[PDB]
């Protein structure tokens, strides 16, 4: 579905690592440019904790995208709708709860 409705409990790690076209000349001098038209997009390490009988609904939602078909999401960092994609979403089962460790990669479109 077009939006993400679950909430990140403990917080997430965001990695920016923008693209720069960079050239190092002789005596220390150099050249930089933002390379791409929109370089920095950032990725989020989203961690979720869900009941064992419920985790099916979240699994079904994440799989229906299947890498492609970016969905709107409001991170508890900036509070703005941004279209992000999900590639791996590693899951960890226990006798009571299931833990989701997923990567959300922001895309301009």
């Amino acid at each position: 579905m077009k939006t993400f409705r679950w909430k990140v409990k403990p917080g997430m790690d965001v990695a920016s690592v923008p693209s720069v076209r960079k050239v190092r000349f002789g005596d220390g001098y150099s050249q930089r440019a933002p390379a791409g038209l929109n370089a920095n997009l950032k990725t989020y390490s989203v961690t979720l904790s869900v009941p064992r009988e419920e985790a099916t609904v979240l699994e079904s939602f994440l799989e229906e995208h299947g890498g492609w078909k970016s969905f709107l999401w409001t991170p508890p960092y900036e509070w703005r709708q941004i279209k992000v994609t999900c590639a791996k979403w590693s899951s960890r089962v226990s006798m009571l709860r299931v833990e989701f460790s997923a990567e959300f990669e922001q895309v301009v479109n």
């Binding site: 050239v23 190092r24 000349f25 002789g26 005596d27 001098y29």
Partner: protein
């Protein structure tokens, strides 16, 4: 570049000592091209016989005449990329047998 060509023409129309004590136009044609040759190879032989080199600008085609030209660009240590090994410029010499 009809303008470049016009300059070049004016140059190769100059009067130069003939070699048998008369004067003579510097360069003139008098070919009779009697085979299919590759367009670029032909164009290069023209622009070799008259001193120039053909420059495909990318946009147009001009002729840079092999002369003392003004507008000399400058390059030093602070200008060209510095690789990991401290060699900004690599030189290489033609062989004596060449």
């Amino acid at each position: 570049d009809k303008w470049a060509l016009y300059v070049i023409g004016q140059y190769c129309d100059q009067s130069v000592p003939d070699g048998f004590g008369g004067t003579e136009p510097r360069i003139t044609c008098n070919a009779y091209l009697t085979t299919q040759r590759k367009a670029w190879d032909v164009l290069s032989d023209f622009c070799s016989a008259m001193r120039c080199m053909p420059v495909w600008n990318g946009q147009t085609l001009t002729f840079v005449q092999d002369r003392p030209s003004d507008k000399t660009w400058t390059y030093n240590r602070s200008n060209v990329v510095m690789p990991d090994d401290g060699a900004p410029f690599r030189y290489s010499f033609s062989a004596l047998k060449d």
